[PDB]
């Protein structure tokens, strides 16, 4: 079992936090919020670094480029914005979604961004030019998550329509539709580190690890609460192999990936834990909560 203990509480977003992500170089935590702001924080000391501003409405997601130099954010203002973190400059505004942009991610090479929107599409963007390369008719409901696989050749998307779909980055073809019994809304999805699996949250208080090629669910994680929000989930791999997720009961849940047993529950937030992230090299978790809390927390374990 891990022994994550609270080290720092980070405050100053003035509305609900929506997402936290560690920079791939491990130096920084980025946060996004309904307050229309991005904030940067020191990953090891929790020290506030800077605020990045420009969206006209709240932000639902933020993501780092592979070299830790750029961010992309997804906003209710129907745009995504690419940011140079060190200068704070908005390099590009990605326009084309027709409704709230909810999720986003760079590909590993970081020349591309993928986004998902309440307009039910997935879009693939050129980072350098800011242009939308493709618009995928991905879902019949809002798109809750988009993620590239390890070599960027595939995209997984999830939607309240109950589907998780796999897309060929190059062609835009749907290569797979994963069916979950009773089609509960899918609130989060992401590839496993090896790209062979997808971790999917559904709004029935359940997380599942799927061999998506075989359409086989390998693991199921429960005990937490998730029926209303798109809570992120992670693979913790720096120490023990765990699954990490926020919960609507204000806790962070940690499970043994193989045994599916809850190994830890982190107490301290006062509202829904919407987002968790795992540091790339140290056993450190960042968590963030909604409007009644507005804090980000950094926790560390010796294993």
């Amino acid at each position: 079992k891990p022994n994550y203990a609270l080290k720092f509480t980070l405050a100053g977003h003035t509305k609900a936090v929506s997402s936290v992500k560690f920079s791939p170089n491990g130096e920084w935590l980025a946060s996004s919020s309904a307050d229309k702001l991005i904030k940067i924080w020191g990953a090891y000391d929790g020290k506030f670094e800077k605020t990045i501003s420009g969206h006209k409405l709240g932000i639902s997601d933020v993501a780092w480029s592979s070299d830790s130099n750029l961010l992309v954010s997804a906003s209710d203002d129907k745009t995504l914005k690419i940011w140079d973190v060190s200068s704070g400059k908005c390099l590009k505004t990605l326009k084309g979604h027709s409704n709230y942009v909810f999720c986003c991610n760079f590909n590993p090479q970081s020349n591309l961004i993928v986004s998902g929107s309440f307009d039910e599409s997935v879009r693939i963007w050129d980072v350098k030019t800011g242009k939308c390369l493709k618009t995928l008719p991905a879902h019949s409901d809002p798109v809750s998550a988009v993620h590239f696989n390890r070599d960027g050749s595939l995209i997984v998307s999830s939607s309240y329509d109950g589907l998780c779909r796999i897309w060929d980055t190059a062609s835009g073809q749907c290569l797979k539709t994963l069916i979950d019994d009773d089609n509960p809304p899918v609130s989060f999805v992401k590839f496993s580190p090896n790209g062979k699996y997808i971790l999917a949250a559904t709004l029935d208080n359940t997380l599942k690890l799927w061999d998506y090629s075989k359409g086989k669910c390998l693991k199921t994680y429960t005990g937490h609460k998730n029926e209303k929000y798109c809570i992120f989930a992670n693979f913790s791999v720096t120490g023990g192999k765990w699954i990490v997720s926020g919960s609507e009961d204000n806790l962070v849940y940690i499970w043994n990936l193989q045994t599916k047993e809850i190994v830890q529950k982190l107490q301290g937030h006062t509202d829904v834990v919407i987002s968790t992230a795992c540091h790339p090299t140290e056993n450190i978790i960042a968590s963030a909560a909604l409007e009644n809390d507005k804090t980000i927390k950094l926790w560390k374990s010796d294993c």
Binding site: A34, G58, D61, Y160, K228
Partner: peptide, 8 residues
């Protein structure tokens, strides 16, 4: 919008 609930 991620910060707002989806009525089940």
């Amino acid at each position: 919008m991620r910060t707002e609930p989806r009525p089940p």
